Amino acid sequence: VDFPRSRLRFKEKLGEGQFGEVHLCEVDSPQDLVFPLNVRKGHPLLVAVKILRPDATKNARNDFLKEVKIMSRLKDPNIIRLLGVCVQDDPLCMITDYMENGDLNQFLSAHQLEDKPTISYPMLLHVAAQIASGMRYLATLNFVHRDLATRNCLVGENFTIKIADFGMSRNLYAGDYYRVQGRAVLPIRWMAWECILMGKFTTASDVWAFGVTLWEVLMLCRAQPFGQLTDEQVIENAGEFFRDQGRQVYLSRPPACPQGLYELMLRCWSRESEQRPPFSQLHRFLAEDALNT
Ligand SMILES: CCS(=O)(=O)c1ccc(Cl)cc1CNC(=O)c1cc(OC(F)(F)F)cc(N2CCNCC2)c1
């Protein structure tokens, strides 16, 4: 059953969509609803609401209803949660937790690595481990994300990370997608070679993108993957992975990244998809290192 729309109180616009908007809202008298809201009595309960325009087209309403159906399955501490929906009248609504530190690319971009806002090496590992645990969960569901990157991760309180999917809706990240007329829009610099050559997207290609997302984290989001290469060179490099003549190239080791952790990234970029580590091993490695450094 629907969330009570009358309890949602507009505060400000968080984002623009092609077909609607994302609003920051307060929930009036939320203890009543407790709908798995995270309620500290007498403290504002803030949620993000994705909202479809009242004049929304049939195509847009269909896509929203499918996004409700997909997101309704996802129940893990490191994945965006649907707290509720309002789908029986317009505008159609989907409600999620407000992640007050924004997307992870913006968050890390505002920090530098601590020198013996700053962030420590073990906390960077903890952020990456949370991402690997959320991806571990999605792999158990045979859910392929297809667009894992730090711009699609959200940051809450106490460095909590949740994986989400903004759906290529943002000017800020337009140069992270390769656009050709009549083709799917493609985040080529995070795509495994078989995705670029074949459209083959699998949990093994989500591991390759996790390798690139881990690179971004250890770069503190200071640089686009392959940022000195054109898009055409990035595509040509996918070709060199297939050709396997030893001319393919890889992201370089970030300044913050020890060689051991770099070798973990390199395994995620194995030419053979079956040589790439599973997310359960990636999580273990990063959490152990998070716990012990
Ligand atoms: C925070 C981003 S947002 O755009 O502000 C916003 C705000 C509130 C709400 Cl309720 C929803 C959203 C946006 N949709 C998502 O985040 C989301 C998360 C998903 O699950 C994850 F793949 F595992 F990531 C999957 C999807 N699918 C829609 C796109 N095709 C694939 C399935 C969307």
CA distances from 253 to 88, 114, 214, 284 (A): 51, 18, 11, 21
Q: Are residues 138 and 161 in the same domain?
A: yes
Q: Are residues 180 and 263 in the same domain?
A: yes
Cα separation, 69 vs 288, whole angstroms:
35
Experimental method: X-ray
Degrees (nearest 5) of the Cα angle 216, 219, 222? 90
Cα separation, 124 vs 166, whole angstroms:
23
Mutate to test the pocket of ligand 1, among 21, 49, 66, 71 (most ligand atoms within 8 A of CB): 71
To one decimal place, what's the resolution in Å?
1.6
Number of domains in the chain: 2
- The answer to whether 71 touches 82, Cβ cutoff 8 Å, is yes
Q: Are residues 121 and 74 in the same domain?
A: no
Catalytic residue among 147, 176, 206, 289: 147
- The answer to whether 35 touches 3, Cβ cutoff 8 Å, is yes
Omega within 30 of 0 (cis) for the link into 77 = no
**Residue at a domain's end among 97, 121, 136:** 97
Q: Are residues 124 and 256 in the same domain?
A: yes
Q: Are residues 38 and 119 in the same domain?
A: no
Minimum CA distance residue for ligand 1 atom 7: 50
Q: Are residues 40 and 124 in the same domain?
A: no
| Cβ neighbours of residue 148 closer than 8 Å, sequence gap 6 or more | 131, 135, 163, 190, 206, 209, 210, 213
Cα 146 to chain centroid distance, Å, stands at 10
CA distances from 134 to 128, 129, 188, 210 (A): 10, 9, 22, 11
- Taken in order 98, 224, 76, 82, is the CA torsion positive or negative? positive
Q: Are residues 263 and 164 in the same domain?
A: yes
State the first-to-last Cα distance of the chain, in angstroms, to the nearest integer. 46
Cα separation, 45 vs 67, whole angstroms:
24
- The answer to whether 24 touches 97, Cβ cutoff 8 Å, is no
The CATH code of the domain that includes 238 is 1.10.510.10
Give the range of the structural domain holding residue 22, as residue numbers without chain letter: 5-97
Pairing of strands 118-119, 112-113: parallel
Which residues are annotated binding-site positions?
14-22, 50
Pairing of strands 161-163, 153-155: antiparallel
Known active-site residue 28:
no
The string of DSSP codes covering 25-65 is EEESSGGGT-------TTS--EEEEEEE-TT--HHHHHHHH
